[PDB]
Each structure stands twice: as C-alpha cells, then as structure tokens.
Design a protein around this ligand. Structure first.
Ligand SMILES: CC(CCO)CCO
Length: 180
C-alpha cells in the first residue's frame, strides 16, 4: 500500500493481549472488542496519528500455541475486533517487529494483533493459561462487530475504516513510510 505498508485483507498472524486501550493511536477508542495491529500493517508511526488500519474490522482465529507446542486444543472462539491501536516496531520486537526488509516476526508471522483485555475480547479468544497464539485473520464488514465508537481524543482522530470496503482501499489513509 501507499508508504510501503503491507495491508492485506487476510493472512496469518500471531496474537497476544494487552491492557489499557482507552487512549489508542487512532485517537478514538471503542466499547466493543478492539485490537492493536503491528506497525507495518497499521499504516503510521508513533506520533503521526491514524493509519489506514484504523476502524477496520477483522475476524481472528487462533489455532496454535507456539509456547506450548504439545497443546492440541481447545482454542478460544473466533472473535471480530475493530482496530483502534498501533503495536509499534520499537515497542515490541518479538511480535510487532515486521519491517519491509524483514516482514515476519520471531514466530514467522507477517501480522500481529494485540487484543485489548479491557473490553472483554481476550477472555473470549485465549484459553486460560495460553496468552500467545498464532492463527489467521480475515477482514469482514463491521456489521459483524458489536459496540460503539468513543469520542475523538485529538484532532485528526479517525476510525473511518469502519465503513470502508476491504483492502485494497483507502479510508483514514497511511502516514509516512513503513519501517525498513
Ligand atoms: C509492500 C512492501 C513490501 C514489504 O516487503 C513495500 C515494498 O518495499
């Protein structure tokens, strides 16, 4: 995509959970299940505001625990998340360090979703005692997402991906250049 970001409607991903998503990088939070996505797919860098992932909705499915390779299941439910936040290259190397020159992380996955614990999404997705998974995602209509958007935290906030057709397409738009 513009800026060299890697933005595809379906693919393989790793998954973790995090706390505190009330002031996210897209500049609006949301009351439903939300996630952060790795910088190379988010479409922006820290401090530059919303990128084109902002507001898009994705169905997530986990099917392996790389830290418990003997574990056969069961895994959690498929959930639909809205992306509101950025998982930056500098902040999390193991999971979100994909760059244009090295587009997979330490688990071989080209994408990563960090699922926000606050609003309930991680409790549906991760079985107890398994806080990191790999699996797949697919972009879906936000008709499949439940919740409502919060108010803008600053000018330029954007979740307009929530009404956009699936990638490839442009809604909030990418900022700057993807990490090399
Ligand atoms: C679409 C990107 C490729 C990532 O390897 C930008 C090309 O540099």
């Amino acid at each position: 995509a513009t800026g060299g970001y890697v933005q595809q409607a379906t693919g393989q991903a790793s998954f973790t959970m995090y706390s505190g998503c009330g002031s996210p990088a897209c500049g609006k939070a949301a009351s439903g299940f939300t996630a952060a996505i790795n910088q190379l797919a988010f479409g922006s860098a820290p401090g530059l505001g919303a990128g084109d992932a902002c507001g898009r909705c994705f169905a997530l499915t986990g099917n392996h625990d790389p830290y418990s390779p003997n574990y056969t299941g069961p895994f959690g439910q498929t959930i639909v998340v809205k992306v509101t936040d950025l998982c930056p290259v500098q902040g999390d190397q193991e999971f979100c360090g994909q760059t244009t020159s090295n587009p997979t992380n330490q688990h071989g996955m080209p994408f990563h979703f960090d699922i926000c614990e606050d609003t309930g999404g991680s409790a549906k997705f991760f079985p107890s005692g398994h806080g990191a998974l790999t699996g797949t995602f697919t972009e879906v209509s936000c008709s499949q997402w439940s919740g409502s958007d919060g108010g803008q935290l600053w000018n330029g906030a954007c979740l307009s991906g929530e009404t956009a057709p699936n990638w490839p397409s442009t809604a909030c738009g990418n900022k700057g250049t993807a990490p090399s």
